[PDB]
Write a protein that binds this DNA or RNA. Structure first.
Ligand SMILES: [Mg+2]
Ligand SMILES: [Mg+2]
Ligand SMILES: [Mg+2]
Ligand SMILES: [Mg+2]
Ligand SMILES: [Mg+2]
Ligand SMILES: [Mg+2]
Ligand SMILES: [Mg+2]
Ligand SMILES: [Mg+2]
Ligand SMILES: [Mg+2]
Ligand SMILES: [Mg+2]
Ligand SMILES: [Mg+2]
Ligand SMILES: [Mg+2]
Ligand SMILES: [Mg+2]
Ligand SMILES: [Mg+2]
Ligand SMILES: [Mg+2]
Ligand SMILES: [Mg+2]
Ligand SMILES: [Mg+2]
Ligand SMILES: [Mg+2]
Ligand SMILES: [Mg+2]
Ligand SMILES: [Mg+2]
Ligand SMILES: [Mg+2]
Ligand SMILES: [Mg+2]
Ligand SMILES: [Mg+2]
Ligand SMILES: [Zn+2]
Lengths: 53, 122, 86, 203, 105, 50, 118
RNA sequence: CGCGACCUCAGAUCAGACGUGGCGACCCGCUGAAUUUAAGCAUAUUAGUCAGCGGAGGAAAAGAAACUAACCAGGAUUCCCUCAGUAACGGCGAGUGAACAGGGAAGAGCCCAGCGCCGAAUCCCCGCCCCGCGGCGGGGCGCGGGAAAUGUGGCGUACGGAA
């Protein structure tokens, strides 16, 4: 498909982060908490939510 | 008879339109007389009938505009002809309310340090 | 040949009446006016012709809104009020 | 505060992190149009320092201009006159590219007012700036007495009359012995007073 | 061409000086306007002095004038602090204040 | 030509109506200076532009 | 869902209709091309009298913005007579002349008598 | 596959607003000559002037020091007198050419970002009730909707400030 410009631009922005040498201070955010610890963290964080309006 | 603007204002719109449509028949009858060639008394009545029609239509339009501005009196959005027509730059100004706000800093500054009235001996 | 004989072939016109300025300067083939420049949004005027500016200025025509503006200015642009009736 | 960290972070433009970010952002803005709306400020601390407040009616536009000097717009060679004014190639525009970017934003968006602008990237042929724009008819600006000065008709097209910071830097105004030629309103105002002959009644 | 004896004069009339000629025929008109504005201000501040706030004792720099004394722009913060007057209240009772001034002496 | 347009024919109509002499009764008026119509036009002499 | 064509087209979104909170003008304008304003006066000329007598027509000077349909339905209301056909021309005066042919059962000169032209 | 966020980007005759163009004497930002003078002429001079372009207001611009000074020191900006046809620039030729100090006209000062502390303590819009209502505002309700933590408001800004 001949995709629109914004779709093509974001898709080959996603490829440039795989091509170019990402410095470690930006690369450290790709290293992420795994699937089971995040649910425990949000389960704990649901008990300390700020009040609504 | 002399059609006056003072006694047309209490009348209803339909009996005003009846007089308007009668005076338009009068103009058509006078303009036939003008092109056939008629009396000067018939020729000079054209200006009389035309201004009477202008009077009746002025009363009708003024009454309709007054009822429209009575209907839209308390509404936030009103038609642009009923909105006030000043100059364009003067319609794009700030309000009394908007020019009369001052900040909490200037409010406490005016409170704490007011302009004193004083005099100096000679 | 170049003069009197050549003047007999003038039978099709270059300019017509412009629909914005009313002058016969609308070039039919360039589709633009040599007096006001009608397809341009701004009217054409220049400071190298002061005489051409004073033929089309705000005092030249009818002033059918500005002369009522000048009269309404003297009363602060009062609106929606009537004089007190008899 | 995080803003002090981001401010000192943007001062290390030769570092690996900033040379990565500036290059990928310059590539991204090179693929867009010459003028388009940014959804949010790219550099928030500097927009904040220049006067952007994150509320309704504050608009950010990102814009690119072409780099280099000003070639004289004259046919082939042929700038007719004395040898002083045969210069065409190495001439320079008297206003900065940031000042050009501000008026190119403000002319396309004539209903808004230019507040300031900042640099976000460049390459060999483009410089990228982001312009802060204020709607003067939104109520969040109209009813805020801190920022209701911009709503006044005096401040129409500040970026065209040279009243923003970027167009202000090119007028040569300031206090000191280095700016004697703009004493008064401006450079032309100094010239008018210095070349106006005062002929008194009693001489 | 020069005459027998005289000065070498350089008149600065080589530009279009006749366009920028400032005549002073409205000088007696602006004097009356300034006087009427002055009296209107003096009636607006009715018991307050017509000149305005009090100006401080100030020496002149730049050795041609260092013996004379002058009216300055405002009293300094050190002077107001020694006199016991708050800097945001001094301007309300007709004391001229500027914070740029220093006190070397 | 006989292949006129509406705006040209209307312009010719107005310039036809302005080409009449002055009425006889206007120079019996008090504040009158007009002797005749000086803005008159003949089809052979003045060619109306266009 | 598969992409059958290699062309991306803009998908058709919902378009709402105008529901303004106030009319832009307060009242509709009055129809200034009224049935009295559209017919000004007839001609009493000798070229129009033969046109009335022979061809059973009437000759009017009408407004220049008038259609043949409007002239027809204007004669049918002012003079209570139906129309066979309307033929219009624009004079070098600038006025629009209308030849209005009546029905075969109505007589144009007996209509002209009651309106005044004779 | 589907569903739900957020980001980025579209389309609306969507609801409510704004800009366009004119005049242009005075003002602001660019662009910008050649006649002329140098008894020629090319640097200069004409002149940052005419022409060209954009943008305003009843004035505009400037404006509260990254200042002047070298003193026993002054103290925002604008304008007048003087400095001064001076310092200085210049085929050092023709010509060009300020500023400080001083005397007056006027005189008015201020606010943010940051850094911090406060439960976003802040702002906009729609529906209803009453009032004002011809420069669309005020309080009261709405388990009404959004903006905003990628930072609104209060204190607070170089004269120090906060607890
Ligand atoms: Mg504050
Ligand atoms: Mg041709
Ligand atoms: Mg123009
Ligand atoms: Mg030269
Ligand atoms: Mg001699
Ligand atoms: Mg001929
Ligand atoms: Mg809409
Ligand atoms: Mg230049
Ligand atoms: Mg010479
Ligand atoms: Mg000579
Ligand atoms: Mg020569
Ligand atoms: Mg000019
Ligand atoms: Mg304009
Ligand atoms: Mg104006
Ligand atoms: Mg100003
Ligand atoms: Mg000074
Ligand atoms: Mg001297
Ligand atoms: Mg020499
Ligand atoms: Mg010079
Ligand atoms: Mg001085
Ligand atoms: Mg004084
Ligand atoms: Mg804060
Ligand atoms: Mg300061
Ligand atoms: Zn034209």
């Amino acid at each position: 498909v001949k995709w629109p410009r914004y779709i093509r631009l974001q898709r080959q922005r996603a490829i440039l982060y795989k091509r170019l040498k990402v410095p470690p201070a930006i690369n450290q955010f790709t290293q992420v908490l795994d699937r089971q610890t995040a649910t425990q963290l949000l389960k704990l964080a649901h008990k300390y939510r700020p009040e609504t309006k | 008879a002399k059609i006056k603007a003072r006694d047309l204002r209490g009348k209803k719109k339909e009996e005003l339109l009846k007089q308007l449509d009668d005076l338009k028949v009068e103009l058509s009858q006078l303009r036939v007389a003008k092109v056939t060639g008629g009396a000067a008394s018939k020729l000079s009545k054209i200006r009389v009938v035309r201004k009477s029609i202008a009077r009746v239509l002025t009363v009708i339009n003024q009454t309709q505009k007054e009822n429209l501005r009575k209907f839209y009196k308390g509404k936030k959005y009103k038609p642009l002809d009923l909105r006030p027509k000043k100059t364009r730059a003067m319609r794009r100004r700030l309000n009394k309310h908007e020019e009369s706000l001052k900040t909490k800093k200037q409010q406490r500054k005016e409170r704490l340090y007011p302009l004193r009235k004083y005099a100096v001996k000679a | 040949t170049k003069g009197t004989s050549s003047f007999g072939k003038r039978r099709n016109k270059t300019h017509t009446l412009c629909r914005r300025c009313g002058s016969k300067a609308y070039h039919l083939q360039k589709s633009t006016c040599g007096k006001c420049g009608y397809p341009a949004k701004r009217k054409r005027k220049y400071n190298w012709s002061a005489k051409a500016k004073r033929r089309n200025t705000t005092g030249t025509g009818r002033m059918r809104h500005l002369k009522i503006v000048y009269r309404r200015f003297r009363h602060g642009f009062r609106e929606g009020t009537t004089p007190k009736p008899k | 505060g995080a803003y002090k960290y981001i401010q000192e972070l943007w001062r290390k433009k030769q570092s690996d992190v900033m040379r990565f970010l500036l290059r990928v952002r310059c590539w991204q803005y090179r693929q867009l149009s010459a003028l388009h709306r940014a959804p949010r400020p790219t550099r928030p601390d500097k927009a904040r320092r220049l006067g952007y407040k994150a509320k309704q009616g504050y608009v950010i536009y990102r814009i690119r201009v072409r780099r280099g000097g000003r070639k004289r717009p004259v046919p082939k060679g042929a700038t007719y006159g004395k040898p002083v004014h045969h210069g065409v190639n190495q001439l320079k525009f008297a206003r900065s590219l940031q000042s050009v970017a501000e008026e190119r934003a403000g002319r396309h968006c004539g209903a808004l007012r230019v507040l300031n602008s900042y640099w976000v990237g460049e390459d060999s042929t483009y410089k990228f700036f982001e312009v802060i724009l204020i709607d003067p008819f939104h109520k969040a600006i109209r009813r805020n007495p801190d920022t209701q000065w911009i709503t006044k008709p005096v401040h129409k097209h500040r970026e065209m009359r040279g009243l923003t910071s970027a167009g202000r830097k090119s007028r040569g105004l300031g206090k000191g012995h280095k700016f004697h030629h703009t004493i008064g309103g401006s450079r032309r105002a100094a010239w008018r007073r210095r070349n106006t002959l005062q002929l008194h009644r009693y001489r | 061409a020069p005459s027998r004896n005289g000065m070498i004069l350089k008149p600065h009339f080589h530009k279009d000086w006749q366009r920028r000629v400032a005549t002073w025929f409205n000088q007696p008109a602006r004097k009356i306007r300034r006087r009427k504005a002055r009296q209107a201000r003096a009636r607006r501040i009715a018991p307050r002095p017509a000149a305005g706030p009090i100006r401080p004792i100030v020496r002149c720099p730049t050795v041609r004038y260092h013996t004379k004394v002058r009216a300055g722009r405002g009293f300094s913060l050190e002077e107001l602090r020694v006199a016991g007057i708050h800097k945001k209240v001094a301007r309300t009772i007709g004391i001229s204040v500027d914070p740029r001034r220093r006190n070397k002496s | 030509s006989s292949h006129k347009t509406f705006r040209i024919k209307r312009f010719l109509a107005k310039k036809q109506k302005q080409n009449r002499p002055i009425p006889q009764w206007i120079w019996m008026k008090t504040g009158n200076k007009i002797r005749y119509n000086s803005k008159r036009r003949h089809w052979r002499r003045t060619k109306l532009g266009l | 869902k598969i992409r059958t064509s290699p062309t991306f087209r803009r998908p058709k979104t919902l378009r709402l209709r105008r529901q303004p909170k106030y009319p832009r003008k307060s009242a509709p304008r009055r129809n200034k091309l009224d049935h009295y304003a559209i017919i000004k006066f007839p001609l009493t000329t000798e070229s129009a009298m033969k046109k009335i007598e022979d061809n059973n027509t009437l000759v009017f000077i009408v407004d220049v913005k008038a259609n043949k349909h409007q002239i027809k339905q204007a004669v049918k209301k002012l003079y209570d007579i139906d129309v066979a056909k309307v033929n219009t021309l624009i004079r070098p005066d600038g006025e629009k002349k209308a030849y209005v042919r009546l029905a075969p059962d109505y007589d144009a000169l007996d209509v002209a008598n009651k309106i005044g032209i004779i």
